[PDB]
């Protein structure tokens, strides 16, 4: 019965909140882990190597001139670069010799500059860490303890994966996701396989979103272009592939790519949490009965639901 | 593979090979050229299979030039001060040898707060050696 | 044969309590005895091996992690309890002047041993210079946990 399912879900949710309010990020870190920091002087295209090389997608930056944490190197960083050299060709050398220090320079230059680098102390409750992340669409926050030092970076994914793995109450979230006003709908850009990658990459920036779905004349979801696909697109300095179509670009994707996940309005967060535990999912595209894009369920949407409710 | 009344799944057309295959079946000239993309050993201190005097010497050499200073010996241990002044200690070990670099404090845990500074100066000191030899 | 005596305790309820973790391969429980005095508390004396051991409790058939004990996640993300078990600017001429060096080799042919060597590091760990960039790192302690800080710097 619906109402019996509702009560079981609201209880399970309050419980998870009670969990996250009682533990600190510190409490959730491994007994021994590793942090990869990159010197501000390092070459942007060179930093692209280290990321892929160690299979990480972000890394904190340290300014040696000032002996301080210089922020978070992520994917948006590289995308900015792509739009620059694109709208400013014949400046290759300014891009090929660009350093992490100059990164802020290009960003704050042609194009709106995201001048924000959240951070939180390791002893604050985990629930508080999730709130700060719910602002920075990066969905990741560095734990900093002053003198400054980076203890670790915390991701939305690691959190959702922590709950799904340690909080049995996830088994009790059976309310169909469509009944939970969490799905993101209208205002979600899409494209076609033939669409030029720079235009898709451009869409990434603008709409300030991590992925752009690819549909057909009608609205069938065929695949998806994720901001992440940008790294491999420029491995150790590239600009050639910048003239291909999304369709062609997507062929650089590694043989080990897990694939795009979809679900429907009738799927339950129980099932969704289940899949987050079994794989590196970062979003679930919501298709209808025949496979037409209806919306998207982000980790953010999910995390936002678990903390503040629908 | 196992899943009940679930409706969560991997969009088959997004698996690399399949999409690769379809791109080729559509016959795009570029497509036939595009290939999939493919892909440490931490060691203690620094190794060197050379004479322990020419090693110990280049360390002091590289040092003096970097602005560092050391204490009066009377040995294979360097007690240096670099700059607040950062303390550090170098040890040589046994042929085949290893040079150990250890953080040791400040002057004019705290170790933790001084994680990068230390690693930075040790970085500079390695590059100085490299160029010399 | 030198295993250090450690005592694990539980104080949050139950009639039947058990422990499991790395020291058992997570496949076998060790029962906890009730606190002769304090009620609601259990304990057990084991002689673990030196190092870090991860564990959790089975309280009346439910899996649990003590709130009054150090907690940490696994590589995967498994929340658990753990405990760490323990035990002048002048270059001396002997490295510069060849005359003083040939005298070295004379008295010599007429450095210490690298000790076997966590809780025993804050040194320098280096790696092979792969590209125009250098990879350096040091193991640091933060509260009761360890972080291997790795600094990547352009040569």
Curated annotation (Swiss-Prot), chain A:
Boundaries of every CBS domain copy: 31-91, 112-170, 183-242, 251-310
GO biological process, one term: regulation of invasive growth in response to glucose limitation
Subcellular location(s) per record: Nucleus; Cytoplasm
Chain coiled-coil ranges: none
Key word Transmembrane helix present: no
Effect of residue 231 to E: Decreases SNF1-activation efficiency
Disruption phenotype: Leads to a decrease in the length of G1 with respect to the wild-type strain along with a smaller difference in the cell cycle length of parent and daughter cells.
Annotated ADP 1 binding sites: 36, 140, 155-158, 280-282
UniProt binding sites for ATP: 184, 189, 210-211, 298-301
Consequence when changing residue 240 to I: Leads to resistance to 2-deoxyglucose
Assembly information from the UniProt record: AMPK is a heterotrimer of an alpha catalytic subunit (SNF1), a beta (SIP1, SIP2 or GAL83) and a gamma non-catalytic subunits (SNF4). Note=Interaction between SNF1 and SNF4 is inhibited by high levels of glucose.
Other remarks in the entry: Present with 11700 molecules/cell in log phase SD medium.
Record's function text: Adenine nucleotides-binding subunit gamma of AMP-activated protein kinase (AMPK), an energy sensor protein kinase that plays a key role in regulating cellular energy metabolism. In response to reduction of intracellular ATP levels, AMPK activates energy-producing pathways and inhibits energy-consuming processes: inhibits protein, carbohydrate and lipid biosynthesis, as well as cell growth and proliferation. AMPK acts via direct phosphorylation of metabolic enzymes, and by longer-term effects via phosphorylation of transcription regulators.
The name this protein goes by in its record: 5'-AMP-activated protein kinase subunit gamma
Source species: Saccharomyces cerevisiae (strain ATCC 204508 / S288c) (Baker's yeast)
Gene coding for it: SNF4
UniProtKB/Swiss-Prot annotation, chain B:
Conditions for induction: Expression of the SNF1 gene itself is not glucose repressible.
Complex formation: Component of the AMP-activated protein kinase complex also known as the SNF1 kinase complex (Snf1c), a heterotrimeric complex composed of an alpha subunit (SNF1), a regulatory subunit beta (GAL83 and substoichiometric alternate beta subunits SIP1 and SIP2), and a regulatory subunit gamma (SNF4). Interacts with the transcriptional activator SIP4. Interacts with SAK1. Interacts with CTK1: Interacts with adenylate cyclase CYR1.
Record cross-link Glycyl lysine isopeptide (Lys-Gly) (interchain with G-Cter in ubiquitin), residues: 2
PTM annotation: Sumoylation by the SUMO (E3) ligase MMS21 leads to inhibition by interaction of SUMO attached to Lys-83 with a SUMO-interacting sequence motif located near the active site of SNF1, and by targeting SNF1 for glucose-induced destruction via the SLX5-SLX8 (SUMO-directed) ubiquitin ligase.
Extra remark beyond the main annotation: Present with 589 molecules/cell in log phase SD medium.
Cross-link (Glycyl lysine isopeptide (Lys-Gly) (interchain with G-Cter in SUMO)): 83
UniProt-annotated location(s): Cytoplasm; Nucleus; Nucleus membrane
Modified residues (Phosphoserine): 28
Summary of the function given for this chain in its UniProt record: Serine/threonine protein kinase essential for release from glucose repression. Catalytic subunit of the AMP-activated protein kinase complex also known as the SNF1 kinase complex (Snf1c), a central regulator of cellular energy homeostasis, which, in response to a fall in intracellular ATP levels, activates energy-producing pathways and inhibits energy-consuming processes. The complex phosphorylates histone H3 to form H3S10ph, which promotes H3K14ac formation, leading to transcriptional activation through TBP recruitment to the promoters.
Protein's recorded name: Carbon catabolite-derepressing protein kinase
Family recorded in the similarity comment: Belongs to the protein kinase superfamily. CAMK Ser/Thr protein kinase family. SNF1 subfamily.
Name of encoding gene: SNF1
UniProtKB/Swiss-Prot annotation, chain C:
Annotated region (Kinase-interacting sequence (KIS)), positions in chain: 1-110
Compartments, as annotated in UniProt: Cytoplasm; Cell membrane
Coiled coil (UniProt feature): none
TM stretches of this protein: none
Domain of life, per lineage: Eukaryota
Induction section of the entry: Induced upon shift to nonfermentable carbon sources.
Post-translational modification: Phosphorylated by SNF1 in vitro.
Assembly information from the UniProt record: Component of the SNF1 kinase complex, a heterotrimeric complex composed of the catalytic alpha subunit SNF1, one of the three related beta subunits SIP1, SIP2 or GAL83, and the regulatory gamma subunit SNF4. The beta subunit serves as a bridge between the catalytic and the regulatory subunit. Interacts (via KIS domain) with SNF1. Interacts (via ASC domain) with SNF4.
Misc. comment: Present with 300 molecules/cell in log phase SD medium.
Family as reported in the entry's similarity comment: Belongs to the 5'-AMP-activated protein kinase beta subunit family.
Function statement: Beta subunit of the SNF1 kinase complex, which is required for transcriptional, metabolic, and developmental adaptations in response to glucose limitation. Has a structural role, mediating heterotrimer formation, and a regulatory role, defining carbon source-regulated subcellular location and substrate specificity of the SNF1 kinase complex. Involved in the regulation of aging. Acts as a negative regulator of nuclear SNF1 activity in young cells by sequestering its activating gamma subunit at the plasma membrane.
Protein name as catalogued: SNF1 protein kinase subunit beta-2
Source organism of this protein record: Saccharomyces cerevisiae (strain ATCC 204508 / S288c) (Baker's yeast)
Gene name, Swiss-Prot/TrEMBL: SIP2
Entire protein: shown range: 161 to 412 of 415
């Amino acid at each position: 019965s619906q109402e019996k399912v509702s009560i079981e879900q609201q209880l399970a949710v309050e419980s998870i909140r009670k969990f996250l309010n009682s533990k600190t990020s510190y409490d959730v870190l491994p007994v021994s882990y590793r942090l990869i920091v990159l010197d501000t002087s390092l070459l942007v295209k060179k930093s692209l190597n280290v990321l892929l090389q160690n299979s990480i997608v972000s890394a904190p930056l340290w300014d040696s001139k000032t002996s301080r944490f210089a922020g978070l190197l992520t994917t948006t960083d590289f995308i900015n670069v792509i739009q620059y050299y694109f709208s400013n060709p014949d400046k290759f050398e300014l891009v090929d010799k660009l350093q992490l220090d100059g990164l802020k320079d290009i960003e704050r230059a042609l194009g709106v500059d995201q001048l924000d680098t959240a951070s939180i102390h390791p002893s604050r409750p985990l629930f508080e860490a999730c709130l700060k992340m719910l602002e920075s669409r990066s969905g990741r926050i560095p734990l900093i303890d002053q003198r400054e030092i980076v203890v670790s970076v915390l991701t939305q994914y690691r959190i959702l994966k922590f709950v799904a793995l340690n909080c049995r109450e996830t088994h009790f979230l059976k309310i169909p996701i469509g009944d939970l006003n969490i799905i993101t709908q209208d205002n979600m850009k899409s494209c076609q396989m033939t669409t030029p990658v720079i235009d898709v990459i451009q869409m990434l920036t603008q709409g300030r979103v991590s992925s752009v779905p690819i549909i057909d004349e009608n609205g069938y979801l065929i695949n998806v272009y994720e901001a992440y696909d940008v790294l491999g697109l420029i491995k150790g300095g590239i600009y050639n592939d910048l003239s291909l179509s999304v369709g062609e670009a997507l062929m650089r994707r590694s043989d080990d790519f897990e694939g795009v996940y979809t679900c429907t309005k009738n799927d339950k967060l129980s099932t969704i949490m289940d899949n987050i535990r079994k794989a590196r999912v970062h979003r679930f595209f919501v298709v209808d009965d025949v496979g037409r894009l209806v919306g998207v369920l982000t980790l953010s949407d999910i995390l936002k639901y678990i903390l503040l409710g629908s | 593979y196992k899943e009940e009344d679930s409706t969560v799944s991997i969009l088959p057309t997004s698996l690399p090979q399949i999409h690769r295959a379809n791109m080729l079946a559509q016959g795009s000239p570029a497509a036939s050229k595009i290939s999939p993309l493919v892909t440490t050993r931490w060691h203690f201190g620094i190794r060197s299979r050379s004479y322990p005097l020419d090693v110990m010497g280049e360390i002091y050499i590289a040092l003096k030039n970097l602005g560092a200073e050391w204490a009066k010996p009377s040995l294979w241990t360097i007690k240096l001060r670099w700059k607040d002044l950062m303390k550090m200690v170098i040890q040589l070990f046994q042929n085949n040898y290893l040079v150990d670099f250890k953080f040791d404090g400040w002057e004019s845990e705290m170790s933790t707060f001084s994680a990068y500074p230390f690693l930075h100066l040790t970085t500079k000191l390695i590059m100085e050696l490299a160029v010399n030899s | 044969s030198l295993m250090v005596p450690v005592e694990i305790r539980w104080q949050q309820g139950g009639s039947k309590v058990y422990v499991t973790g790395s020291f058992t391969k997570w496949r076998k429980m060790i029962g906890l005895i009730p606190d002769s005095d304090n009620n609601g508390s259990f304990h057990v004396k084991l002689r673990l091996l030196p190092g870090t051991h991860r564990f959790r409790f089975i309280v009346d058939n439910e899996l649990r992690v003590s709130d009054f004990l150090p907690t940490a996640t696994d590589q995967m993300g498994n929340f658990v309890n753990y405990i760490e078990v323990r035990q002048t600017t002048d270059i001396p001429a002997v490295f510069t002047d060849p005359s003083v060096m040939e005298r070295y080799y004379y008295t010599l042919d007429r450095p210490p041993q690298l000790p076997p060597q966590h809780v025993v590091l804050n040194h320098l760990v280096t790696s092979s210079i792969k590209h125009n960039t250098l990879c350096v790192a040091s193991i640091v302690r933060y509260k009761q946990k360890y972080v291997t800080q790795i600094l990547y710097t352009p040569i």
